[PDB]
Structure formats: C-alpha cells, structure tokens
C-alpha cells in the first residue's frame, strides 16, 4: 500500500550557534547641528561588535 | 572573495588575498591589524611605489594608494626629500 509521504513543510536545520555568518560594526551617534553629523562614539560601547 | 562557506571558514591571506582581488577584510582580518592591511591594500592593487627606491638622503619610503610618503630627516624637505 503506497500513499506516498507527508511533506507540505520543509524540514530545516540550523547552525548549532544560532548564526555563524556575522560581521563586524562600529557604533555611532547622531551628531548636533549638521542634519546628518554623523560622528563616531566609543566612551561606553566597545568599537568592534558583531 | 565575499562568500557563504569561504568567510565561514576561517579567512587565510594565502587562501584569499592571492587568488582572489583581495579586496578587503578578508584584506584584514586575517591580518587583524589596521597597522599592517593598510600595508597591504596598496601593495595589491596599485603596486609598491617605494620598489624604486625614491626617497633620497636616506629616507623612509612609506607604500600609500597611489602615491607614497618619504620622512626626511633635519634640513630636508620637498616631495620626496630632495
Ligand atoms: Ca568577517
Ligand atoms: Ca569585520
Ligand atoms: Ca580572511
Ligand atoms: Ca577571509
Ligand atoms: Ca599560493
Ligand atoms: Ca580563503
Ligand atoms: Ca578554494
């Protein structure tokens, strides 16, 4: 007796850490009188986070 | 180059900056310096211009994008320390 299967959903399988793919940023912060003064900022956060 | 499993694997200077453009970070990281790929992305794309040695009165040749800088001792100066 062959029905055949079940399989409307894909079945997945993710990296064992979530994401393995990240990349490496900088923050920054909105500058003050300039429309976009755009400036970089480090005093508390760590310049490289991915 | 830019990929999915490429950068996935650890990035090697001999594995990407060779074969491929070297285009950057993969420029960098495994150099992890901005002290050294700096150093190394001008010397890729535009050629080493302190081959020629052109810094005279003994001064120090420095490889930039497109151009290069000579430090020249006490009582010299001009473009490149003439
Ligand atoms: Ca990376
Ligand atoms: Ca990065
Ligand atoms: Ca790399
Ligand atoms: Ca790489
Ligand atoms: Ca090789
Ligand atoms: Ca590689
Ligand atoms: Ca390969």
Redesign the pocket.
Same mark, same amino acid.
């Given at each position: 007796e062959n029905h055949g299967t079940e399989d409307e959903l894909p079945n997945y399988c993710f990296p064992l850490g979530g994401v393995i793919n990240?990349?490496?940023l900088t923050k920054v912060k909105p500058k003050t009188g300039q429309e976009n003064g755009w400036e970089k900022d480090a005093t508390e956060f760590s310049d490289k986070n991915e | 180059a830019n990929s999915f499993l490429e950068?996935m694997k650890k990035?090697h200077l001999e594995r990407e900056c060779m074969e491929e453009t070297c285009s950057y $970070?993969?420029a960098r $990281?495994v150099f992890e310096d901005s002290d050294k790929t700096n150093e190394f992305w001008n010397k890729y794309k535009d050629g080493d211009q302190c081959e020629t040695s052109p810094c005279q009165n003994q001064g120090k040749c420095k490889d930039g994008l497109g151009e290069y800088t000579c430090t020249c001792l006490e009582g010299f100066e001009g473009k490149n320390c003439e």
């Open positions: 990240t990349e490496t | 950068e990035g $970070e993969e $990281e």
